[PDB]
C-alpha cells in the first residue's frame, strides 16, 4: 500500500509527455513506449494483442485512466 503515489504520478507525469497536444487521450502504440518508460522492455507477444485491442485499423484512442487500466 506504501507504493503507489510515487508510481502513479509517475505514469501520470509519462502521459503528459506523451501527450503533447494534452487532449487526455493518445494512440495505442504510444502505450508500448510507455512501457519502456518503466526500465523494462516488452517483448513482443504483449503488446501484439494491445494492437489488436483497437479492433479496427483506423487510430484507436485511449485515455490515462484506460491506458493504466491496461498496463496494470
Ligand atoms: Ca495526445
Same mark, same amino acid.
Given at each position: 500500500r *506504501?507504493?503507489?503515489? *510515487? *508510481?502513479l504520478e509517475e505514469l501520470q507525469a509519462a502521459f503528459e509527455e506523451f501527450d503533447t497536444?494534452?487532449?487526455?487521450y493518445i494512440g495505442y502504440r504510444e502505450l508500448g513506449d510507455c512501457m519502456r518508460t518503466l526500465g523494462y522492455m516488452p517483448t513482443e507477444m504483449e503488446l501484439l494483442e494491445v494492437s489488436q485491442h483497437v479492433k479496427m485499423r483506423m487510430g484507436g484512442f485511449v485515455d490515462f485512466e484506460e491506458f493504466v487500466e491496461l498496463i496494470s
Open positions: *506504501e507504493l503507489g503515489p *510515487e *508510481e497536444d494534452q487532449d487526455g
